[PDB]
């Protein structure tokens, strides 16, 4: 009791020192610095392509490395590879369990990762001597629902599960090589850094934790939400990231300085955010909401510059090509739209 | 094909074949009755699993009855926040709840502050008032009635219900329990609750399930075709 109380007081006074340093270094907010720039007037994106063929709610998608192919997953039990130029299907993969919540595309373009309520992450090999697609590896070390997964490289993967833990695996051996246990709530998303050395992870306890892949300790933490966290993605530079919560608000955090750079929210919106993605230059932030349409925010002024109102249901997945030319959005109506 | 090469034509043909296969798979899979089996604490969940049968996150059960294919989802072992994965069962046909009424005098395995029936009622109320199950039918399946009948003779149900005054027999107590469980419903118009007492024969349980799902199917078809 006494030891716990004194230790909690010590942690609180370290937090007070940290926030005092934050306030001392916060001479002017990001909005004050960036108000001098010229804001964008109005951007309009039209649906160049409309992918159809899914018969259930689409929950995840990932753009390809060449900005030409993409992957999509729904509850129908099918994983579909789409050619975004001519609207062609390259591969259709049946899933063992139809309860899937995430999918990833390998940077080399040879493997695809999937996972969901089955507590198992499945890897499928695309470039095979045979004419079909076969499962290469199965990870079953978690005891909670898998919420996100991203290929670290051709041989390593990182997954976030519902058991308040994250796991960096080793595909060739099949066993976890690093375990991250610092969350008190279900983990919903993660995003890899552009330099491929660190990664941030969001959970339901309104805290985002930054982890080191090589070492594997609680490198950084951030607490700025009042509800659960649904999406997270790094800035194109890699020194910042953006998180979306269930309180109809997104926040921008900085890796180097533990700050809250900007809060993207509006009084009209009362529903949370399912997906968050950035642009190539880091000027446009794309946020998918529960009000059946997406939104575009100018990241340096926190104002709305466009609405991609073309979906009849809640949007769940959003992605941007590596060259930043097309925006692919999916929704629960089983329709994928490429806005440009 | 005016400005499409031979390889482009072959790719288009492959895409059309994939579309045909996907449509066939969807048509094949859009004719199976999905049920969500759910219980509170230590109940007769596995009991009715064995009666109706005749990867720890979710358990899939497949069976057939009267040329009707039933897929039961048992997600008791997920052990996570229900609000983050319950929306994927929005399109489920029916929810088979599990309550044993013989645990009225038995306290919780973790504390004696409350008995299991109150937790069952509190979780039934949460399930009924869910935003994703406004028009999802619920079956009750009050089981373990024999033990309750034996226990009601030695110990009355006044302990569980201090405001209840009855004959303390079996029929009256069962009727009171059923009425209290039915009163937890808040809509009473968009959704309905079906109550049944399990017997030693699997036929009664499977027939009740078949009748309930048939009624739900008829209601859904009537709503779809605009006759109501």
């Amino acid at each position, epitope marked *: 009791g006494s030891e716990l109380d004194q230790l909690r007081q010590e942690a609180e006074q370290l937090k007070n020192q940290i926030r005092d340093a934050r306030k001392a270094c916060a001479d002017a907010t990001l909005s004050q610095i960036t108000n001098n720039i010229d804001p964008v007037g109005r951007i309009q994106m039209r649906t160049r392509r409309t992918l159809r063929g899914h018969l259930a709610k689409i929950y995840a998608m990932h753009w390809g490395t060449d900005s030409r192919l993409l992957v999509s997953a729904s509850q129908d039990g099918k994983l579909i590879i789409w050619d975004s130029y001519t609207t062609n299907k390259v591969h259709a993969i049946p899933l063992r369990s139809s309860w899937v919540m995430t999918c990833a595309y390998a940077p080399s373009g040879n493997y695809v990762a999937c996972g969901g309520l089955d507590n198992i992450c499945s890897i499928y090999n695309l470039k095979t001597r045979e*004419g079909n697609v076969r499962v290469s590896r199965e990870l079953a070390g978690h005891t909670g629902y898998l919420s996100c997964c991203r290929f670290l490289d051709d041989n390593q993967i990182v997954t976030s599960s519902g058991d308040t833990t994250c796991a960096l695996w080793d595909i060739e051996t099949g066993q976890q090589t690093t375990t991250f246990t610092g969350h008190t709530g279900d983990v919903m998303s993660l995003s890899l850094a552009p330099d491929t050395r660190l990664f941030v992870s969001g959970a339901c306890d309104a805290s985002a934790k930054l982890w080191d892949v090589r070492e594997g300790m609680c490198r950084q933490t951030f607490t700025g939400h009042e509800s659960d966290i649904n999406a997270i993605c790094f800035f194109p530079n890699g020194n910042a990231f953006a998180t979306g919560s269930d309180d109809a608000t997104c926040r921008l955090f900085d890796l180097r300085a533990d700050q809250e750079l900007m809060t993207y929210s509006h009084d009209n919106i009362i529903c949370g955010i399912t997906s968050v993605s950035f642009s190539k230059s880091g000027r446009l932030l794309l946020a998918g909401y529960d009000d059946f349409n997406c939104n575009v925010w100018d990241a340096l002024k926190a104002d709305r510059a466009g609405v991609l109102a073309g979906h009849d249901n809640r949007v769940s997945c959003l992605g941007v090509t590596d060259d930043g030319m097309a925006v692919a959005t999916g929704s629960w109506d089983s329709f994928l739209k490429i806005w440009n | 094909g005016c400005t499409l090469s031979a390889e482009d034509k072959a790719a288009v043909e*492959r895409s059309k074949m994939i579309d045909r296969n996907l449509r066939e798979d969807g048509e094949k899979a859009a004719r199976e009755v999905k049920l969500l089996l759910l219980g509170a604490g230590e109940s007769g969940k596995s009991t009715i699993v064995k009666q109706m049968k005749i990867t720890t996150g979710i358990v899939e059960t497949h069976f057939t009855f009267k040329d009707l294919h039933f897929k039961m989802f048992d997600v008791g072992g997920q052990r996570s926040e229900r609000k983050k994965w319950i929306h994927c069962f929005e399109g489920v046909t029916a929810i088979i709840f599990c309550v044993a009424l013989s645990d009225y005098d038995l306290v919780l395995a973790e504390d004696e502050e409350m008995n299991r029936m109150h937790e069952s009622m509190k979780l039934f109320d949460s399930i009924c008032n869910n935003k994703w199950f406004t028009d999802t039918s619920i079956i009750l399946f009050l089981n373990k009635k024999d033990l309750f009948e034996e226990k009601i003779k030695k110990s009355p149900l006044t302990i569980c219900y201090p405001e209840y005054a009855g004959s303390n027999t079996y029929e009256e107590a069962a009727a009171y329990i059923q009425c209290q469980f039915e009163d937890l419903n808040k809509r009473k118009d968009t959704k309905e609750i079906y109550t049944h007492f399990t017997c030693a024969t699997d036929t009664k349980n499977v027939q009740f399930v078949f009748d309930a799902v048939t009624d739900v199917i008829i209601k859904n078809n009537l709503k779809d075709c605009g006759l109501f």
Partner: single-chain antibody
């Protein structure tokens, strides 16, 4: 993965013959098939093509309406029925698998084929040279010509470079004029420009001797060119 052929033998001018090909080790139901001819002591020529699902069937112009092709997915067997065989129908026959999607590489596996002896507009491919003596350890170049631009509006060139070692089945080296095949050394390379195509070898080994062919796939019928022979 393998394909084996059967049906070859001695045939009189008046008669019919069915050539069978059986494939094992891959998904035959999703691979388009090509029947390709190769006259002895002369270049190889196209015969027929069948697409996946038996949707598209193409025949050679000189043998149009004269041969028939059929596919069997449950048994993974390809049949080529021939009704008439003249004095010019003596050659070897090969079956080639090819699957078409984005990033795919058609003409990967060639089988072994079988011989057949008889008891007796289109873009043209040509190569000026036919026999270039060379010693190992030096770069070599083989040139092919075309009568029209092979660059389609999509943005790729339908040019292929193969290899036929003496006594061995042909294999794939370069597909789409700029992409290397699978399982081949990096020494081989291809460079196309307008109507001039060059296959270049940086370091030459004793296994690189044989007859090279230049291949086009812009449109049907698929007219082929004469190979160039490199000898040790």
């Amino acid at each position: 993965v393998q394909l084996v052929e059967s049906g070859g033998g001695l045939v009189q001018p008046g008669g019919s013959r069915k050539l069978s090909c059986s494939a094992s080790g891959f998904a035959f139901s999703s691979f388009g098939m090509h029947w390709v001819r190769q006259a002895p002591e002369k270049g190889l020529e196209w015969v027929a093509y069948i697409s996946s699902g038996s949707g598209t069937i193409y025949y050679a112009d000189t043998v149009k309406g004269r041969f028939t092709i059929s596919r069997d997915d449950p048994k993974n067997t390809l049949f080529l029925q021939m009704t008439s065989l003249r004095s010019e129908d003596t050659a070897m026959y090969y079956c080639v698998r090819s699957i078409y999607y984005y990033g795919s590489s058609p003409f990967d596996f060639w089988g072994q084929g079988t011989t057949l002896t008889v008891s007796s507009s289109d873009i043209v491919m040509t190569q000026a040279t036919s026999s270039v003596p060379v010693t190992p350890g030096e770069s070599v170049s083989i040139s092919c010509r075309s009568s029209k631009s092979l660059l389609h509006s999509n943005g790729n060139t339908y040019l292929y470079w193969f290899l036929q070692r003496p006594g061995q089945s042909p294999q794939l080296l370069i597909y789409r004029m700029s992409n290397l095949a699978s399982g081949v050394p990096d020494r081989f390379s291809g460079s196309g420009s307008g109507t001039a195509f060059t296959l270049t070898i940086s370091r030459l080994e004793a296994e690189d001797v044989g007859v090279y062919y230049c291949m086009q796939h812009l449109e049907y019928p698929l007219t082929f060119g004469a190979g160039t022979k490199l000898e040790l």
